Amino acid sequence: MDVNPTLLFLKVPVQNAISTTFPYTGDPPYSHGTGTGYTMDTVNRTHKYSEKGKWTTNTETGAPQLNPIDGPLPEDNEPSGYAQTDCVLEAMAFLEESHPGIFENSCLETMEIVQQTRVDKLTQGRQTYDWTLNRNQPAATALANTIEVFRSNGLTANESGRLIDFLKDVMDSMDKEEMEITTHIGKKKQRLNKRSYLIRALTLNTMIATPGMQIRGFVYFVEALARSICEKLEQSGLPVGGNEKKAKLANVVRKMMTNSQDTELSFTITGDNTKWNENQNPRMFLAMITYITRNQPEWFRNVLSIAPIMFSNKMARLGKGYMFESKSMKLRTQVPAEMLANIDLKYFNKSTREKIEKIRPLLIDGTASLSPGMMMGMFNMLSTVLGVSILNLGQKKYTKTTYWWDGLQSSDDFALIVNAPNHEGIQAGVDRFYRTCKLVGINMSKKKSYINRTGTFEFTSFFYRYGFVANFSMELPSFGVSGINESADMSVGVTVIKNNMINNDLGPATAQMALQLFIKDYRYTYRCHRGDTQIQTRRAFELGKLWEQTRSKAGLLVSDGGPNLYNIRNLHIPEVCLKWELMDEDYQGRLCNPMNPFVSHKEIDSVNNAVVKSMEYDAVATTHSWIPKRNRQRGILEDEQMYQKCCNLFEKFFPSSSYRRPVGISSMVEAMVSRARIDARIDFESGRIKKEEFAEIMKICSTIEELRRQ
Amino acid sequence: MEDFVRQCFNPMIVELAEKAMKEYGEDPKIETNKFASICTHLEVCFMYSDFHFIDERGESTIIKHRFEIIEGRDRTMAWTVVNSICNTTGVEKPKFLPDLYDYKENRFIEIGVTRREVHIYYLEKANKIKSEKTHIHIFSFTGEEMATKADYTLDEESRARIKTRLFTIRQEMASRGLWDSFRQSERGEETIEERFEITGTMRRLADQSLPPNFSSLENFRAYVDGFEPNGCIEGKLSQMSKEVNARIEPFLRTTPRPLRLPDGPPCSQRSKFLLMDALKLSIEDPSHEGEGIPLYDAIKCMKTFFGWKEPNIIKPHEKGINPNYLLTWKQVLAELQDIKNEEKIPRTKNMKKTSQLKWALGENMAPEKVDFEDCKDVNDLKQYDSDEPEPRSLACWIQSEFNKACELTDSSWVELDEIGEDVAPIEHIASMRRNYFTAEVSHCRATEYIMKGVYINTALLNASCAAMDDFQLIPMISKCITKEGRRKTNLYGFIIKGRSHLRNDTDVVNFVSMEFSLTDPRLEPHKWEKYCVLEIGDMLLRTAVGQVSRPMFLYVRTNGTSKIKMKWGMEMRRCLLQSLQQIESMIEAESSVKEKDLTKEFFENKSETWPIGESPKGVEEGSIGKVCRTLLAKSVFNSLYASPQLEGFSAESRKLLLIVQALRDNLEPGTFDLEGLYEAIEECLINDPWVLLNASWFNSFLTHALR
Amino acid sequence: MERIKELRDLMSQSRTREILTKTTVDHMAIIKKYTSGRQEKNPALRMKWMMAMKYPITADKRIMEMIPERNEQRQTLWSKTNDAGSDRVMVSPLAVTWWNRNGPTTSTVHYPKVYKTYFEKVERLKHGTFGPVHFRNQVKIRRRVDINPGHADLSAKEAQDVIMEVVFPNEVGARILTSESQLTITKEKKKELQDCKIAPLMVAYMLERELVRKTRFLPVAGGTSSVYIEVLHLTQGTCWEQMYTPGGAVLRGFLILGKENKRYGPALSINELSNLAKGEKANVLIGQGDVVLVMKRKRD
Ligand SMILES: [Mg+2]
């Protein structure tokens, strides 16, 4: 007898036993599938899918640019980017007609967002391409470096604190004749001409790719507008959560089936768009943004249109380069992509030879010019808006025929449902939807899509079967220690189990097993094994002494070697409060001593909250609230901690700055000096500071004021 | 901003500002800075006039209004009232409209609320409007104020109220992130709408980012503004060729075909430790001095075995130096004997660096790094070999491995922690279900693999952190509970860890694993292409005919592991969770159908069966326990044999599974590019034994389900 | 004092001086977001790797005055080292356990008050009653439900107002000082937390949690009240329903008279504004460092 788990599908339907079709529970330990060859392949494919468009040379960057808009209509089923401007404008017009006033309300909300936004928003992104360092850097560091360079170049609008002023500075810099970059090593100066700076500001480092700080704000505003548009569409799967997706799937299925007559025939397509990024054109986004922002203040239109304009002239960096190895002398060397333009083609294989030959004409200064197409994770919501417009174009008042379609679109994925009197009607509807998508520049992956009678389908890993919906967009989440500290980790683990039980259909027995495994992992990670156990750990002696000392062992925390009192009953209760009544008086006092040297609190945003998304956990500040040790070159800032060093020493003057965002008219130094003087006066009056100290403090305050005035 | 203005200002003041701005045909919803400016000006006007009266003697008394408002009315009414005042009191006609008329001083006073410095605003007002016999009072949101001749008409109290109101408005605007725009929007005496213009380089870029038939962004904007939908989509659809279509090809019973497995030499073992060939030397009760520490337990386990003989190579490593592995084993034995005779066994044993160990651990075996320009002309230089990996044919050893992993062992391998006492009835139900699953799964061989991997990877990570630059010797140990309930400690082999100067989570630490076994490699040499196998001893095995001698071999190989891989290995216990989740989902579905708890009717039934295997007779059915063990083994083997091929195959074959399921439901499934789906599925089958076995399983399932 | 000396040191260097003098107190928060660090990807693996070290925890300077270097078994608790950026000494979990089993004992009387919400959760669970489980098809309707019971339904603005009044009495802005009446909750919390050594930031966070109203979009198949939402995990499931019943001076009225006026004496603090006379005008540092001339509200 040969065991075959797949045979379990002969009795249990696949949708019911879909868990067995997912190999891993967590991130796999390879995280591969990217490289320079991949970037060159994407560039080549994107240019090929629109090769029949019009070629031009940029007047600023002198880069080849391909415009497939209004190009020849496709003649085959291969992916294409020949979107028609009139067709997309008509789709937007009909979307507005079916949802009157949507564009105006979304524009007003986005105007509100634009006026009230702040620069530090840009610090909330992921790793970003710093053009000043010309490599990947953290979002906050990249923003600080760009601000420093702009200041050194006499651009200080961003000092107003508004992101829109930072964008004005970015545009002015794009209009600068020369840019100076100073790296502190000592010191070092470099000069960039207009073309070089423009190319640098119009790059997308590939590692998928990441933009520089010069496009983050414009993209943010465009995505805010697209989010506002999508929030008012019931056919949009973005950006709702896991609880609001099952409802939409069930509602659409019921609407397309129950409303169907006894002679009506309904079918459902589970569909993936083949590329959805290499055929989406920035010109189309510009056209649809221009239509959306009709009859709006000119500044708002300009701000929203800068993003697609900037992306239409983007550049893609080719990455690290290539690795060459020799067998005779076992010699290895690295060839940066910068020299890849001025090298022969005898070291690369046939496929690599073809890639380099194709991509050579498109590269300038080591960056391939990529006008057509897009990249995933950038304009997801605008693409969702376009897909929903196509979906809404399926109403019986637009098809003018018996067949009609409706469904859901989530960025790349979609679920369609076509109702028609007979099979030929369903075929006609599917063909019409496909052809309209092609006209608007959307390609459906024929290999990754399939149709069947309505009742069963899939959408973004949510599997629907006869009303039963199984959510597998994200499988079993990590059930180990998050890695903050003992108290935070315990609270996070129990809260995660509770939330999964509430929302993600986690069963009672599965929840108990998850709790057991989490407790085992917690004990092994933090060496807090039960005090009575004989496992040998560096922490075993102290835990055993504490165990023997205590009277009520049930009150000891798991981190203190106590028992686990958690069950399905009390997953919502913090452990410290759960066993508060069982604690010994002295142990409770020691654990909850506010003067202990371990507890620490950062700004309130990081208080009882962990970033994974961010989840808030309930915990009591105890001795177990310690911090793990911190772990850790060209540089624009001589002192990279100047901002933190200034913000610190302000919380010692005004502690409320930790909890509340301060507001004041005076400058930081003046406020600090005034507070110092007042505190010194009050302390000297109380009689716990002597003449010498007081006069000394008054003398530093005077010299600080003199320095600030000078 | 608009919400703050509406919710902060007195509703009548809001209405006055609305009407005043409508008089000029301006939209508050689109120009909120001007709206707020007018609201603030009107509020200051009212507070200036408010709480003032004139007594019977003409003196000023605080309770005829002392001040007459002029800026809160239409142009016509304001002009009429100012003319009436001038005629009645004979005052000079002001050149520009004043704000308030002071009866007590019989003059015209104008008030200016300035976001910027007070002196600048006062100078601008003096040089702009002030001509003669007009008083100016300039207020600021920072508390400052100014007036002509420093003669402030009001008492200190009223000015204090105005200053407090302005300061509070400033603070609330700042806290709401509106003060920046409000202050930046003041230019001398007027509030200007926000400006964001495209010029210079950005203008040229915009003009270069339009459809083919456009030259200027303004022209494109004009075209879009006047665009009206006139059957454009219908015309374009009627124009494009009919060859662009999505034709549904039916998928009924004959379209599917078996997946094509790759052809080539049979696949070999790539797991980090032996799975079904593992032999363990066991101590039935570790009650010795210094027990618990791995080294002492390993020494005791080795002592229990008598029959070590002179090692020799049985299966050489084709690409490796067998004498180095032989000398490594000899060095391990020598060091173990040395520590045994020392009588001072330390907690950790660091191996002495040796040529054999230096080579085996790959210490300094790497090409030197040089610049390209220095070695560009080398004839033998070439790009790093990244060709198509050699396809391998499926072998029956992986199926046998999976079969073994699915069957019970004689002893338990899991001792999960405790939880709080059950109180709710649902808690009791969950406990019963979990205990049933645990009983079905406690003794499984997959559980043994889970514990083995967890222990090995935990030891490896701890050693790598503790001993960065030492050749540590790490015994491969596991703990078990026999049927009799006595703790048993099993030793499978040894791992020598090399340099562990790990900085990132992907850099590899290289180790050498030598594992005891009873299986002869020569039976399946292709399975052991990466192993060097030496015969290390002789063992006595019990059978119906007494004791029989069997050679005992040592499988020695070199492997590498990163921090991420070690964490993945240590987290192997989640396979239990996965299997339990599936088994519990089945039970809950059945209970929902039957509206009652069916844990007993699922686990104690021992009569209901699920198809779980295939035999020459046909499909084989097993109890719920067999299904639990099969799913656990599948999860464990997925964890052990993780690869990009596995995830790709799973993702691609899920679509085929769902299409087949739709067929089985008589839902008339149809495809568009089914051949493309087949190609995508088959591109992920190259050499991995696990993926090939999964593909064979899928083929068998297709064969059985289609019928 | 160390603080003013550090301020002078910062003002010595040109760039730090420029940022201090240029950026206003409004924009301080903005420059707080220019972090030069780097968040650890996959912190769980990082913690697993750290815990195998000897001293993976960071204490403060004063720990060396209380926790001995070694315990009875001669195991080192803390090491004479420093973190990467401050004077936080390196310690080990052995130090944490040593403190928990031998450290000074205090009186934890304010903990039930400050963490009132958690102990209310505990009491509600303790006094609840349980009914039988019903197995059947479950159809949960998804709606917006409150998260924290017992709250005052206070606006975030007003909740922050109360928190600033209570935790940070001498940093209230112009709005608080210029108001006419004080909310009773503020006085009650001020009296309740007179001598509280818990970190003021923790007290503020707990007060904000206990006073603000929070809502979430959740499926529900039974009761909707807040007390029934905290136990949603225990009461409802995919195919079962568990029947559970839950077991449960006046420093206001001041008018600003402009900016600081040196003729009226040195700037005071808010806490000492009570000593003023009926109509005396003084200089007070309100908010986060804004000196203004203030007077008491005479002739209401
Ligand atoms: Mg899909």
Residue numbers in the entry:
A (entry chain B): 1 to 184, 205 to 227, 241 to 645, 653 to 672, 679 to 756
B (entry chain A): 1 to 63, 73 to 716
C (entry chain C): 1 to 248, 689 to 740
Question: What text comes from the article?
Answer:
In the nucleus of the infected cell, influenza polymerase (FluPol) uses the viral genomic RNA (vRNA) as template to perform synthesis of either capped and polyadenylated viral mRNA (transcription), or unmodified anti-genomic copies (complementary or cRNA), which then serve as the template for vRNA synthesis (replication). ANP32 is required for both vRNA to cRNA and cRNA to vRNA replication. ANP32 comprises a folded, N-terminal leucine-rich repeat (LRR) domain followed by a Glu-, Asp-rich intrinsically disordered region known as the low complexity acidic region (LCAR). First, it stabilises the formation of the replication complex, an asymmetric FluPol dimer comprising a replicase, which is part of a parental RNP and synthesises the genome copy and an encapsidase, a newly synthesised apo-FluPol, which binds the 5’ end of the nascent RNA replicate to nucleate formation of a progeny RNP.
To characterise structurally the FluA asymmetric replication complex, without interference from the competing symmetric dimer, we therefore used in the following analysis the monomeric FluPolA/H7N9-4M mutant, bearing the PA/E349K, PA/R490I, PB1/K577G and PB2/G74R mutations. To characterise structurally the FluA asymmetric replication complex we analysed complexes of apo-FluPolA/H7N9-4M with hANP32A by cryo-EM. As expected, the majority of particles are FluPolA/H7N9-4M monomers, exhibiting the PA-ENDO in the replicase conformation (ENDO(R)). Two distinct such structures were determined at 2.77 (CORE-ENDO(R)-1) and 2.54 (CORE-ENDO(R)-2) Å resolution respectively, differing in the degree of polymerase core opening. Focussed refinement on the separate replicase and hANP32A-encapsidase moieties further improved map quality to 3.21 and 3.13 Å resolution, respectively, allowing a relatively complete model to be built, with the replicase core being similar to that in the CORE-ENDO(R)-1 structure.
